[PDB]
Write a protein that binds this DNA or RNA. Structure first.
Length: 91
DNA sequence: AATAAAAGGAATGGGG
DNA sequence: TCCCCATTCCTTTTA
Protein backbone atom coordinates (compact mmCIF):
# COMPACT_ATOMS: atom_id res chain seq x y z
CA UNK A 1 0.00 0.00 0.00
CA UNK A 2 1.22 3.44 -0.95
CA UNK A 3 2.71 5.60 1.77
CA UNK A 4 1.36 9.08 2.38
CA UNK A 5 4.51 10.88 1.28
CA UNK A 6 4.50 8.95 -2.00
CA UNK A 7 0.83 9.74 -2.61
CA UNK A 8 1.62 13.44 -2.25
CA UNK A 9 4.75 13.29 -4.42
CA UNK A 10 2.78 11.44 -7.09
CA UNK A 11 0.06 14.11 -7.07
CA UNK A 12 2.65 16.82 -7.48
CA UNK A 13 4.26 14.99 -10.39
CA UNK A 14 0.97 14.27 -12.16
CA UNK A 15 -0.64 17.68 -11.59
CA UNK A 16 -3.95 15.91 -10.91
CA UNK A 17 -5.06 18.18 -8.00
CA UNK A 18 -3.25 21.40 -8.84
CA UNK A 19 -5.87 23.48 -7.02
CA UNK A 20 -5.19 21.59 -3.76
CA UNK A 21 -1.39 21.21 -3.67
CA UNK A 22 1.56 22.78 -5.52
CA UNK A 23 5.31 23.11 -5.49
CA UNK A 24 6.69 26.23 -3.87
CA UNK A 25 10.35 25.54 -4.72
CA UNK A 26 10.46 22.27 -6.60
CA UNK A 27 14.26 22.07 -6.64
CA UNK A 28 14.22 22.24 -2.83
CA UNK A 29 11.20 19.95 -2.58
CA UNK A 30 8.95 22.48 -0.79
CA UNK A 31 5.22 22.20 -1.41
CA UNK A 32 2.08 23.82 -0.08
CA UNK A 33 -1.56 22.88 0.40
CA UNK A 34 -4.50 25.10 -0.50
CA UNK A 35 -6.26 26.56 2.48
CA UNK A 36 -9.64 26.27 0.76
CA UNK A 37 -9.15 23.07 -1.28
CA UNK A 38 -7.01 20.80 0.88
CA UNK A 39 -9.97 18.81 2.19
CA UNK A 40 -10.72 17.35 -1.25
CA UNK A 41 -7.15 16.04 -1.35
CA UNK A 42 -7.46 14.59 2.16
CA UNK A 43 -10.70 12.87 1.15
CA UNK A 44 -8.90 11.30 -1.80
CA UNK A 45 -6.14 9.96 0.47
CA UNK A 46 -8.63 8.23 2.75
CA UNK A 47 -10.56 6.72 -0.14
CA UNK A 48 -7.35 5.46 -1.75
CA UNK A 49 -6.44 3.82 1.56
CA UNK A 50 -9.90 2.34 2.12
CA UNK A 51 -9.99 3.76 5.64
CA UNK A 52 -13.07 3.29 7.80
CA UNK A 53 -13.75 7.00 8.37
CA UNK A 54 -13.66 10.01 6.09
CA UNK A 55 -10.12 11.43 6.03
CA UNK A 56 -9.67 15.06 7.03
CA UNK A 57 -6.74 17.37 6.42
CA UNK A 58 -6.18 17.48 10.17
CA UNK A 59 -5.71 13.71 10.39
CA UNK A 60 -3.56 13.65 7.26
CA UNK A 61 -1.30 16.33 8.72
CA UNK A 62 -1.12 14.34 11.96
CA UNK A 63 0.40 11.52 9.92
CA UNK A 64 2.66 13.97 8.08
CA UNK A 65 4.12 15.17 11.36
CA UNK A 66 5.28 11.63 12.11
CA UNK A 67 7.75 11.88 9.22
CA UNK A 68 9.59 14.74 10.93
CA UNK A 69 11.90 12.44 12.89
CA UNK A 70 12.73 10.01 10.08
CA UNK A 71 13.01 12.93 7.66
CA UNK A 72 10.88 12.07 4.61
CA UNK A 73 8.75 15.21 5.08
CA UNK A 74 9.42 18.18 7.36
CA UNK A 75 7.22 21.14 8.18
CA UNK A 76 8.44 24.49 6.84
CA UNK A 77 7.78 27.72 8.73
CA UNK A 78 5.25 28.95 6.17
CA UNK A 79 1.51 28.39 6.08
CA UNK A 80 0.51 24.87 5.02
CA UNK A 81 4.03 24.26 3.68
CA UNK A 82 6.20 21.14 3.94
CA UNK A 83 9.42 19.84 2.37
CA UNK A 84 10.40 16.40 1.06
CA UNK A 85 13.87 15.05 1.75
CA UNK A 86 16.47 14.77 -0.99
CA UNK A 87 16.24 10.99 -0.64
CA UNK A 88 12.49 11.00 -1.28
CA UNK A 89 12.88 13.35 -4.25
CA UNK A 90 15.56 11.17 -5.83
CA UNK A 91 13.30 8.12 -5.79
C1' DA B 1 -15.69 35.69 19.91
C1' DA B 2 -15.10 32.97 15.14
C1' DT B 3 -11.98 30.74 12.34
C1' DA B 4 -7.84 28.36 11.34
C1' DA B 5 -3.21 26.25 11.60
C1' DA B 6 -0.13 23.71 14.27
C1' DA B 7 1.17 20.54 17.72
C1' DG B 8 1.39 16.02 20.03
C1' DG B 9 0.02 12.39 23.54
C1' DA B 10 -2.35 8.40 23.54
C1' DA B 11 -5.31 4.80 22.08
C1' DT B 12 -6.52 2.00 18.28
C1' DG B 13 -6.04 -0.21 13.81
C1' DG B 14 -2.83 -2.61 9.34
C1' DG B 15 -0.19 -5.76 7.72
C1' DG B 16 3.36 -8.00 8.30
C1' DT C 1 5.58 -10.75 19.74
C1' DC C 2 6.16 -6.63 18.35
C1' DC C 3 7.49 -3.32 14.70
C1' DC C 4 5.31 -0.90 10.33
C1' DC C 5 2.76 2.83 8.93
C1' DA C 6 -0.73 5.04 9.89
C1' DT C 7 -5.69 6.46 11.85
C1' DT C 8 -8.55 8.24 15.25
C1' DC C 9 -9.56 10.76 19.24
C1' DC C 10 -8.86 14.53 22.30
C1' DT C 11 -6.72 18.60 24.21
C1' DT C 12 -3.77 22.58 23.97
C1' DT C 13 -1.47 26.54 21.81
C1' DT C 14 -0.82 30.31 18.49
C1' DA C 15 -2.39 33.56 15.14
Amino acid sequence: KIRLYQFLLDLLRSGDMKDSIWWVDKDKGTFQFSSKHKEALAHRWGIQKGNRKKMTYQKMARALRNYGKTGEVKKVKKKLTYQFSGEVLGR
